[PDB]
Point group: D2
Chain length 296, copies 4
Amino acid sequence: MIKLGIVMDPIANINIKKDSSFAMLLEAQRRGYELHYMEMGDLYLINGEARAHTRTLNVKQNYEEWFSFVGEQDLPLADLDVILMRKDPPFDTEFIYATYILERAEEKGTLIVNKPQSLRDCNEKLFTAWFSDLTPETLVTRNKAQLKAFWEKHSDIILKPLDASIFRVKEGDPNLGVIAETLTEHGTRYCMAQNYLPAIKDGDKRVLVVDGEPVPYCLARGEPRPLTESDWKIARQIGPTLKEKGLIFVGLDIIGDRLTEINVTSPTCIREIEAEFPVSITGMLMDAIEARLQQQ
Amino acid sequence: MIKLGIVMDPIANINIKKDSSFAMLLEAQRRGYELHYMEMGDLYLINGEARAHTRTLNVKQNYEEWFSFVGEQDLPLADLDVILMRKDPPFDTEFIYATYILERAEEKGTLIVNKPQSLRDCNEKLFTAWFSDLTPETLVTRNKAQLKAFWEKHSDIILKPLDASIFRVKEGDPNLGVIAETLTEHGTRYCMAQNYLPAIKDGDKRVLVVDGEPVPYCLARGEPRPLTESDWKIARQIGPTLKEKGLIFVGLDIIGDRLTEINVTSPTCIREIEAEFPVSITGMLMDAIEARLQQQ
Amino acid sequence: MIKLGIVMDPIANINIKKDSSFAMLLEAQRRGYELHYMEMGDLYLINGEARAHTRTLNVKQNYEEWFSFVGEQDLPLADLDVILMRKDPPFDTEFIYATYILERAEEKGTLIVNKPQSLRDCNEKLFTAWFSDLTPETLVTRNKAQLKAFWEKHSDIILKPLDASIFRVKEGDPNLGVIAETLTEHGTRYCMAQNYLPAIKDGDKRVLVVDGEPVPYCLARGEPRPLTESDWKIARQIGPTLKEKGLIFVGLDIIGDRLTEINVTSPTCIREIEAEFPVSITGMLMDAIEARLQQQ
Amino acid sequence: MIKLGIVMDPIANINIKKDSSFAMLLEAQRRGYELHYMEMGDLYLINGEARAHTRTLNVKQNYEEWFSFVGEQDLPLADLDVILMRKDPPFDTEFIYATYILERAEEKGTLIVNKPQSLRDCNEKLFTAWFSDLTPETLVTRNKAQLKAFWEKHSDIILKPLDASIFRVKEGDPNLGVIAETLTEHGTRYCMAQNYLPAIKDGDKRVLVVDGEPVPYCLARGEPRPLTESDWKIARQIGPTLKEKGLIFVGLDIIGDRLTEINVTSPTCIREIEAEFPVSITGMLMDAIEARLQQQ
């Protein structure tokens, strides 16, 4: 059958009425896939070969006991058909090292959702630089004088770190300097400034794109809604790029008609959209994995 | 003429009788290129466009004054023909962010030595996993029991961090556990174990590869020597891979006949090999840049 | 009655068959004291006055439910008769700040076990510098050459950080330099070197001293034993110093006949000695608190 | 004669037209004291004895060469008559460890300006809790809800870290939450809130107190002024406390008539007040050291 492995944060600490990874494993199990559970420290490389200690997993929607380990084994990752990298942020050097281990399994045949090269290529915040007609005014910089200047042109801006801690600097704010000194760690780290978008008050929308195809309903942060006309427009412009880069399950953050962020590591909000609308997002996902597998 | 920019650590603090970047700028200047000096904080991105504050640079082999700024300007990086990313390690998230800015200039036409995607793809220590027949026995892992076990099979090993702090664990060593707990930061970070290679006592050799072509003389750490037969063998096996990945100037670390490391960010030792042998490594480099430029 | 407060790490995560703080609260409760539970973040200072959010606590030896909160209140800490600072290490700047808040309650009348000034005065490892006839050869330093030299005089030594990660450097060890560079963080932090004491193989003993009086039975790390003649000697030399500094409950680490460490923040091993011998260490402690209270 | 040692940051990097430590050594030299220069890493403890590697120092007001080492020696610190701890902040655990080494010399007879116990006892920001009638409304806390509440009572406040990065939170500010989450590092570190004092626009004054005696002229941050009537009042209330705690050279920060901070580690502004007024602050200091020495 299909052997599906998943790399995620400790399953003993998730919340099963909210967790999207849990919802994914329930579906994989319903289709009869064999599940192999892994945490970051279970992955290792012995002379170029990617291996891991997996536990064969059984999951059930039960708040006292939602998982059971039914086997334990040390296998080559190239013995799995597909691996869901569902590790949470930050995207740090430890995450970059795990991406090289997954890439060695990938060369030997395993499908990796999402593709390790593209996880390294597509930072959630700096990747929007490749879709500049879809985003707000964005400055990435290490210095105060440029941030101050961006603030004079736009009057009301958003400063965030790259590495949610967002500061709003609007007219008359006494704090531009200390905020920029704290976020750049005194001119030694890049930070991002964008102009403030007042339509955030209508909802910061989370849109999902399953292998280039927008899921028809999104969640505005919480209210599920159909995609508006502008959500369709944005999502279909990025979608072919995400499909060809092997970004099979993607979350887009849209405030009003502007694209603000692209979650490529662990996009969530599956449970809240499936509860209101007649869509099986996890079904869409496993259908996309099954197509990718009987292809290459 | 050719407009060459360079991103490096403060030029006011290098040692000009040793610095390879300095040797590169002297050569570029001798061929009449216009030089543009940049530090990390000079790079920024305004709505997808890569820009920087550069200073037009003049360099001379003079220990009281080896550089002069002769102009200052804010330009788009796509106005440079080529940029030498010569920033020193560590390879951290700040270095990964700079690689995305350089990649936006690269899309608009600038040659980047070395290619930003490949700097992210090719970690100095984990990239040797792709040339496993050329390297020592290597385990990358987060746990103690696997390291202890690697130590039972090999008896005398080398433990290093991924992120030089190398520990040697030979028979009868009382410290395996604390070393692995310190280097893995208590099982939370990957570390590397390799078997100890006694031929390090003959020299840890630094070999240079200019766009897939080995420089005929290397430096064994310090004694310049011609490449042995085994150095030729190793360097010519990796060289086509480095050429196609846009890794135009590479340093390989070879102890005996084993490849231990691949420096892809700021390879040095130019000055020590040019002082003994009749080779102009910087000439080889600028010749390779000139070919790449009158090509694509 | 006596109102006893305790500052400790989350009571929901301790192990009640091992925790010494738990054993203390059971005793305080048996004597009918009112218990007030606090974590670090519950402590605050409003214009010089020390206050905290406490929960009135009920504890029971029950592995499903060992505590219950039976009230919640914001009070001045000067309304407590005594506070057990039982916060675990490290001893960092956050711990030093909490010590100033406890000291403001102390000035207004509360007994603080142990005294905040003395927690700042008596570092577990550097305080043994005041009992140099009782300790091994000890060097505290930032440099390699002094450590190397200490190693030439003693041949087999122990290197530890100040801030258990102990390294043993015995004859023929290849790692002196990297260990000293890692532990001093390249000459920027003090570390400690002591000569290795081979009698650690007989047990690293944990001796308890309740307001200057040694508890007659200690635990050798695990085997409970009576104090030997040399344990009596060591403990009675330090004990008057600990009583006058307000160090009411102290743990001493003794390997052979040498004093290696003085735990002044959260000394444990109560449960393991009470289980074998007919001593109530917590009874000794509450008896000492009751004396101190009907005194000053 | 008097043997004076000084522990300070690298003398090769100070600015001699501004540095107060430099001004102190020029004076000590004019009175014919022998000077012994030390950095932090020169201090060490061998079996309870405080020692250091000193260099015998010669200083001169010359911008090409303001110091010369005229001898080198390893001595016990108890061979110095007095040591100026003039190390810059932060006040961290490394600084606390150095304070224990200086205290071992102090027990053997050396005068330490300022007294090591009192450096540990008197944090620059939390020590103002002992002079609450002289300070603004001050809350030290780890939580958001208390900070928000302090902000409702006062409407315009100052938030600073304990560990200058001050934020001003006045009416209509959108950032209270992220500022408190950044400064408390998500509820894990204490921060300080004080009400904003609008008279800072008249000058944040730096007042100096030499062994309990206010220097008659202060610097308002830069304009030298005589002490006002309220500066005299504040400084003479704290001064007997500073004298008895062995805080011989102290800087007080006064905005309007409120005491905001007490610099106990490395108070400066000597050069700017001596340049305008006929006061020799360093003379006052050496006079105070000379009295302390021919006393105890």
